[PDB]
């Protein structure tokens, strides 16, 4: 629902949402976007689950 959205707000008023109490499997974000930049800093995307 956060990558299926249609009206990602502008940078001047960025929309922030909270995710909790669920199972995070990032294959969905991997296959939901033709990725151009995945520069993670705190945690490597590879073993992220």
């Amino acid at each position: 629902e956060v990558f299926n959205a249609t009206r990602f707000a502008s940078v001047y008023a960025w929309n922030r949402t909270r995710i909790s109490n669920c199972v995070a499997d990032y294959s969905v974000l991997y296959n939901f976007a033709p990725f151009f930049a995945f520069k993670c800093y705190g945690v490597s995307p590879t073993k992220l689950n």
Binding site: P34, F35, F36, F38, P45, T46
Partner: protein
């Protein structure tokens, strides 16, 4: 100015972004299930 023991040439035609996908310690649909480079890769990639 170098001497190499053995030299390997792996050839494959791919998309454009996957060229940047090809690098040691990377990830992607091609980098994870099609062609993963060694972490200590001693060599390089040529893309034209």
């Amino acid at each position: 100015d170098l001497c190499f023991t053995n030299v390997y040439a792996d050839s494959f035609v791919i998309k454009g972004n996957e060229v940047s996908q090809i690098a040691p310690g990377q990830t992607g649909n091609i980098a994870d299930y099609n062609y993963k480079l060694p972490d200590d890769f001693t060599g390089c990639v040529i893309a034209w």
